[PDB]
Structure formats: structure tokens, C-alpha cells
Amino acid sequence: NEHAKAFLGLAKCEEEVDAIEREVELYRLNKMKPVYEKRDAYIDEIAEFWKIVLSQHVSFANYIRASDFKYIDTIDKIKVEWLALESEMYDTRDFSITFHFHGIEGDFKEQQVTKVFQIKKGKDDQEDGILTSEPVPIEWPQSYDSINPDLIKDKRSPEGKKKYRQGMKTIFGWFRWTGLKPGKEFPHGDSLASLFSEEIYPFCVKYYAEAQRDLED
């Protein structure tokens, strides 16, 4: 066959590869579900887990602040949950995660929150493959009104733009994260989407048992 016609067909294979990419993940959304549900059903019957596992992770080094751990300790529950068999609006390669915080009394409200996440790729337009999200409404700490972006008086200042640069690095500025604001939102916030849903689970039970350990190295 002529190269003129053979190229037209090869392009349709590169487009069938990305359609297989959705099918092999639809099979993930179908076949994993009974060990996703079993796993969830054990963390609804354990009293508390996430306020033990997360701080010990070698990659958690990259993400969450000395000051912020007083707020993420109040996490009761974390669940990851898919939409694409319940909704036309979302790809099988997109996902959401749910948190539930008990709060600090007169400081940080008791709240359940969900953030959604969606994958981008070169598709006709060869823009760089990245993970992205929508901003979520969250109740910020009262102690954090010096670094809460919404109470900064003036973001031009040598103190005001540094208080903004602090504030955007919190776990609460991660809830405002989107993936789309270079140097203007939570850094590495995509890899925090992966850590709660996937990169935690290979070690969290090592880590739960490690905090039960009384022996010494």
C-alpha cells in the first residue's frame, strides 16, 4: 500500500490506543469494585486509621506542613470514588476523593468535603499530559487569617505576597488547587491526589502496624 493511505490508517490506531485506555480502566471500575468495597467496609469498621498512616509516608515529606498536621489529625475518614458508570459527564480515567474532618472547636469547622480530578493529554492539540481539578469551597482555620489568601489586604507587599505564597502551600490551598496556575497554587498537588488514593495503600498497613510496635531499632 501507498504511504499516502498507510499513514491515514496508522493515525486511527494511535486514536484506537487511547480508546483502549478508557476500556481497560472501565474494566478497573467494574472488576476492582468488590475489593474496593471490602477495603472501605473494613475502614468504616476501624475507628481511626488515616490520622495514623499518612504522616509516616516517605513521599508525605514532599506535601504536608509542620503547622497543618494539627488540622489533618482531625480527619476521621477518606474515601476514593468513581463517577463514569453513574454519569456521562466524566471519563473512566477521571476520579473523586471524599474527606471527613471532626475539626477544632472555635478554630476550624467540622466538615465533609469532596474534590474531583480529571486527566488531560495531547489530543489533536499536543498540550503536555497533565492531571487537573476544580477548586472546592472549604472552611479555613480562624488562626490562619494572616495567610488565608481571601484576607490578605494587599498581595503586592514583601509580606503580603509571601503570606499568599505560604497560604497557597497549605492543605486548604490544595483544596483550591487546579493544576493550571504555574507558581500560583499548591506545588505537586497532582501527586497529592495520587497519594491519598493509590500511593498510600502499598504501605499504610505496614505503617499502622509500625505505630503499634513497642520494640526499638
Binding site: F60, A61, N62, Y63, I64, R65, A66, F69, K162, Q166
Partner: protein
């Protein structure tokens, strides 16, 4: 640079809580604690490897970084 920031910063908090409850810090100070540690430990590792080399080992052992604490006047 060489140390991972955010667990160091929390190490800095737990060690300090016991000398003052509810102490704060400047971001500049916490990173200074970190850049002093990188610079003291980089220096102490060049010392630990001279202990090893003087011992007629390739390999460093927990002996060698203590001896290097002693060589630099302990404190």
C-alpha cells in the same frame, strides 16, 4: 536542598514544644535550621569518610560519625 523540608520542620517543632509550648517560627528560621544542618552534616560526612579512610576501610560505620563529633570539639 539535600534534606526534605516538611518532616524536618515538624522535627523542629516536636524538639522545641518541650522547651516552649505554642512556640512559632519564621519560615526563614525553619529553613535556616535546615540549611545549617545540610552544611554541618555535609562537613561531618567529609569527616566521617576521613575516619573510614584513616581506618583502612572503604566503608563508613556508626563509629566514624561519632568520632567525627568528637573531632569537631563535640559540644
Amino acid at each position: 536542598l539535600l534534606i526534605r523540608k516538611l518532616p524536618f520542620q515538624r522535627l523542629v517543632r516536636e524538639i522545641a514544644q518541650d522547651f516552649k509550648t505554642d512556640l512559632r517560627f519564621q519560615s526563614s528560621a525553619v529553613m535556616a535550621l535546615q540549611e545549617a544542618s545540610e552544611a554541618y552534616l555535609v562537613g561531618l560526612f567529609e569527616d566521617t569518610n576521613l575516619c573510614a579512610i584513616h581506618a583502612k576501610r572503604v566503608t563508613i560505620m556508626p563509629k566514624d560519625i561519632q568520632l567525627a563529633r568528637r573531632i569537631r570539639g563535640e559540644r
